[PDB]
Subunit: 194 residues, 4 copies
């Protein structure tokens, strides 16, 4: 499934309908995915992953310079599933940045997939170490003409081609205290520029 599809015509939500940090009022255009909807979708992703790969030990890999926050929530949800199974399932968690992967189930966790080049490159590397199974979970997949066409195994949301921030998605180290996925405004785009 392509996940939750936010279409190009869907405007999103007015900033006034949800709680927003006041220091970002002029910095955001609109709210795409409230923090609460991200959690509800992420909980479902954890069940899809466990149903498909969680039978035994997995290696979950967070791609650095990315969405550590989404890796953390997804692993929280996975742990809750394991916490109510009858088996004690071990689990390796590591962080990768672009040897013991061989023979194991590898889940790669990314926060956003824009062009898809990063993930396209990462998989070639991981697959040269020949693992039994390598799957990718991405919170957001952006619909962009700049995309090479890659399709993650597990997709939280499919969003229009807009620059988004909040939850896991910083912008020059700002916006990590924003828990909703919003579209950045030109005022904010230039305010926190580097």
């Amino acid at each position: 499934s392509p996940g939750v599809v936010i279409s190009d015509d869907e405007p999103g939500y007015d900033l006034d309908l949800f709680a927003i940090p006041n220091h970002y009022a002029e910095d955001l255009e609109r709210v795409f995915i409230p923090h609460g909807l991200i959690m509800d979708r992420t909980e479902r992703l954890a069940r899809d992953v466990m149903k498909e790969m969680g039978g035994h030990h997995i290696v979950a890999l967070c791609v650095l310079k990315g969405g550590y926050k989404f890796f953390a929530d997804l692993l929280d949800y996975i742990k809750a599933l394991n916490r109510n199974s009858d088996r004690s399932i071990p689990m390796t968690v590591d962080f990768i940045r672009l040897s013991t992967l061989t023979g194991k189930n590898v889940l790669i966790v990314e926060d956003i997939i824009d062009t898809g080049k990063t993930m396209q490159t990462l998989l070639s590397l991981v697959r040269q170490y020949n693992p039994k199974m390598v799957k990718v979970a991405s919170l957001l997949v952006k619909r962009t003409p700049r995309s090479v066409g890659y399709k993650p195994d597990f997709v939280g949301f499919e969003i229009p081609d807009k620059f988004v921030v909040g939850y896991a998605l910083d912008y020059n180290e700002y916006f990590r205290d924003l828990n909703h996925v919003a579209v950045i405004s030109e005022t904010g785009k230039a305010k926190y520029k580097a």
Copy 2:
């Protein structure tokens, strides 16, 4: 405002996109409002309450029956605002089914407004005990044609005229354990028909 508006043409969410209890698979048609999204709206709703009624001792009245979950969540967010206020703020809670209110800010918390006759009756009575102020917060407002035209002060979501269950909204004491607000199915109403 009318709250978060859910239009008649928006289908909703497919059930496979979120975690729903297995035994309710065939009892639902669509997820309108995931649990996490309810929470986001309710947090802002609480900020709106303290903005209009934070100036006097508030009495929070939960309308029975079947509207208690939203009440607890809303008060949790209100209390979190008072504990950040740097002042000792007293607050009264109470439950009401069809003398302290005198001179206080009275918040009538309702889960669903359909015909609006319930809230119409209650307001007329509550105003008799000459409160400083009477406002109604409602999680859901149904666009039902049988509406006598009453608009509450704080609305979570304005939704189509569909029979909805989940989060706070039960049906013959069923669906309490469902956290999302979903439309019931024909199988749903028949199976659990009292």
Copy 3:
């Protein structure tokens, strides 16, 4: 079991080890149970309830006087258990203060038991209607020489004979926004005296 026993030797927890609202700094002596501990114990209480009341429809009964918060948290953990039972489980919730109890398992939920005379009185009236079973769940049971000897079926915490506030336990409508169970100070009990 007697529950989680907090002995008279234990001074609880220094106030500065936890987040307590600043306006309550001088109004408290010590923290007995942090909010997080309450929740973890309450989750286990929900299991113990289902283990010996899960065979028949439950009527959950909240005694009006303060236990609403703890009622809500206990019910949420019950609902989580049912969510994962792969069975549609109906449940009634009502409120009681100082008829359809014909023959279902009645669960009376209380925040605190001091002398025990309230529970003794209530159980005498409820058993008159001849329910299948009546059980009592209390968050706190005080170790008090004033006790009439009533011990509930499920106990969260057995504490020393001190006047506690926070979480579900208000004091003349004050301390609602306090999340932890803390001992009130003499300066605090005078400051908010009714």
Copy 4:
């Protein structure tokens, strides 16, 4: 302060008082720190951190391969604080396994400090790069005569010198789904030695 001190005489909690995954029933002896109590303390630590060094931009370093769970949670609380600060506070989140730090407020986050040889070493490296200041937050400090004497700047819990698992503390990648800090049993010690 040495944090929350768990005495050598303290037995911890009987496993029957809290929700414990069934597959670990025989693998644990006692519970020292329920998950919720960890959170309540970690929330206080986030406030101590921000008051002391959170006025400006901080670099948060998680030490791998330790307790990313604690790192993620301490940072969730930090973000919640910044989210109400009325200022856009930038933050750097990085990981390290044992020049951009120069002139920055550097917080090292560790799950457990046993002998202290890791922090002693880590601090000597970081201090060569001339940060504006470097501080250590550790969830658990073990009271052990194997200790080289290092005491972190922020301590969650000072615990006896026993082998603990749960919450961010794994044993050969097991116990990652256990959310309480419990003492492993000698059975569990050799069951997962792998």
